Design an enzyme around this catalytic site. Structure first.
Site, PDB file in Angstrom:
ATOM      1  N   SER A  57      38.705  27.228  32.100  1.00 34.38           N
ATOM      2  CA  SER A  57      38.576  25.791  32.432  1.00 34.38           C
ATOM      3  C   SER A  57      37.092  25.218  32.243  1.00 34.38           C
ATOM      4  CB  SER A  57      38.872  25.502  33.881  1.00 34.38           C
ATOM      5  OG  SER A  57      40.427  25.581  34.034  1.00 34.38           O
TER       6      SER A  57
HETATM    7  B1  LIG Z   1      40.843  26.630  34.990  1.00 36.34           B
HETATM    8  O1  LIG Z   1      40.059  26.418  36.236  1.00 36.34           O
HETATM    9  O2  LIG Z   1      40.335  27.844  34.854  1.00 36.34           O
HETATM   10  C1  LIG Z   1      42.347  26.696  34.962  1.00 36.34           C
HETATM   11  S1  LIG Z   1      42.801  27.333  36.664  1.00 36.34           S
HETATM   12  C2  LIG Z   1      44.495  27.643  36.421  1.00 36.34           C
HETATM   13  N1  LIG Z   1      45.380  27.639  35.425  1.00 36.34           N
HETATM   14  C3  LIG Z   1      46.429  28.067  35.863  1.00 36.34           C
HETATM   15  C4  LIG Z   1      47.804  28.010  35.228  1.00 36.34           C
HETATM   16  C5  LIG Z   1      49.131  28.605  35.961  1.00 36.34           C
HETATM   17  C6  LIG Z   1      48.787  29.039  37.327  1.00 36.34           C
HETATM   18  C7  LIG Z   1      47.613  29.158  37.772  1.00 36.34           C
HETATM   19  C8  LIG Z   1      46.512  28.403  37.148  1.00 36.34           C
HETATM   20  N2  LIG Z   1      45.229  28.122  37.625  1.00 36.34           N
HETATM   21  C9  LIG Z   1      44.529  28.815  38.720  1.00 36.34           C
HETATM   22  C10 LIG Z   1      44.530  27.435  39.638  1.00 36.34           C
HETATM   23  C11 LIG Z   1      43.748  27.313  41.088  1.00 36.34           C
HETATM   24  C12 LIG Z   1      42.960  28.537  41.073  1.00 36.34           C
HETATM   25  F1  LIG Z   1      43.492  29.702  41.381  1.00 36.34           F
HETATM   26  F2  LIG Z   1      41.899  29.003  40.530  1.00 36.34           F
HETATM   27  F3  LIG Z   1      42.445  28.677  42.633  1.00 36.34           F
HETATM   28  C13 LIG Z   1      43.669  26.149  41.704  1.00 36.34           C
HETATM   29  C14 LIG Z   1      44.459  25.193  41.387  1.00 36.34           C
HETATM   30  C15 LIG Z   1      44.211  23.877  42.216  1.00 36.34           C
HETATM   31  F4  LIG Z   1      44.882  24.045  43.163  1.00 36.34           F
HETATM   32  F5  LIG Z   1      44.808  22.873  41.636  1.00 36.34           F
HETATM   33  F6  LIG Z   1      42.880  23.552  42.532  1.00 36.34           F
HETATM   34  C16 LIG Z   1      45.364  24.998  40.358  1.00 36.34           C
HETATM   35  C17 LIG Z   1      45.275  26.349  39.544  1.00 36.34           C
END
Ligand SMILES: *[B]([O])([O])[C]SC1=NC2=[C][C]=[C][C]=C2N1[C]C1=C(C(F)(F)F)[C]=C(C(F)(F)F)[C]=[C]1
Length: 252
Positions: A57
């Site tokens: 991200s």
């Molecule tokens: B970026 O921060 O690297 C993307 S993070 C991300 N993308 C996905 C896709 C599918 C399932 C999970 C996922 N995540 C992790 C995520 C996280 C955290 F693990 F990084 F903590 C937190 C959140 C939120 F709750 F919204 F803050 C969403 C996804």
């Protein structure tokens, strides 16, 4: 292919070696910081700092800038409606603007931007920015544990250069991006940044925190990468903030 896992270009700079092993603890990784006033780099674990990893991200910084540059979003309207797909995070299940999308790391917002950017424009930008290995692969979420990789050292160089040099990106776009990245502000400083987290097989594989700090006296660009232990974006952020505080960058 062979050393597109590595950034080997040396610094035409002063580079000060740090020991922040105690703050990292049982986490593995590196920390890089650049001071604009000193024009100098401070690095913990210079070896790891040059190994290239998926930005995850943290790349949303650049998708945001590309989206602004190409007028996909602007300062009047950066809003995008939820398409009524139930994601497992409630913050994703709603309309977004750049600010909320960046804050909550909403993949679908940035994927929707990427889908409207032609590959040739992205290839041109990564070349001009010197973004990591510049490997676009299949051009489908290429920034998320896929083809594109960048080093911790390059995260700082590339972001600093994109923001601070007079390039084709407008000031207003840089300003709107900055606003989306603001995390903390008090009387002493403003802290900007972006987390990244890679997940492989339901486990944390790759944590980032990339950003900058404005004080009364200076501007510092920085980044933390975590390769092992508990390598999450959140953890990279906590480590960054402890290191910056200790170095006198963050007060209050
Ligand atoms: B970026 O921060 O690297 C993307 S993070 C991300 N993308 C996905 C896709 C599918 C399932 C999970 C996922 N995540 C992790 C995520 C996280 C955290 F693990 F990084 F903590 C937190 C959140 C939120 F709750 F919204 F803050 C969403 C996804």
């Amino acid at each position: 292919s062979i050393t597109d896992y590595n950034y080997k270009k040396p610094l035409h700079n002063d580079y000060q070696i740090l020991d922040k092993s105690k703050i990292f603890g049982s986490n593995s990784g590196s920390f890089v910081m650049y001071s604009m006033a000193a024009d100098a780099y401070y690095i913990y674990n210079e070896k790891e700092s040059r190994k290239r990893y998926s930005p995850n991200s943290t790349y949303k910084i650049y998708l945001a800038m590309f989206g602004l540059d190409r007028h996909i979003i602007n300062d009047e309207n950066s809003r995008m409606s939820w398409n009524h797909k139930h994601y497992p995070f409630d913050a994703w299940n709603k309309e977004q603007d750049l600010n909320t999308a960046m804050q909550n790391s909403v993949n679908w917002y940035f994927e929707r931007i990427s889908d409207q950017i032609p590959k040739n424009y992205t290839a041109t930008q990564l070349k001009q920015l010197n973004y990591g290995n510049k490997n676009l692969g299949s051009y489908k979420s290429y920034w998320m544990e896929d083809s594109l990789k960048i080093s911790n050292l390059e995260q700082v160089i590339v972001f600093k250069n994109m923001m601070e040099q007079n390039n084709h990106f407008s000031k207003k776009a840089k300003n709107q991006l900055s606003s989306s990245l603001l995390i903390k502000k008090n009387e002493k400083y403003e802290l900007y940044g972006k987390t990244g987290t890679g997940i492989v097989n339901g486990k944390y594989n790759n944590g980032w925190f990339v950003g900058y700090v404005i004080t009364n006296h200076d501007k510092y660009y920085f980044a933390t990468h975590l390769s092992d232990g508990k390598p999450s974006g959140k953890n990279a952020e906590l480590i960054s903030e402890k290191i910056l505080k200790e170095m006198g960058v963050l007060n209050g």
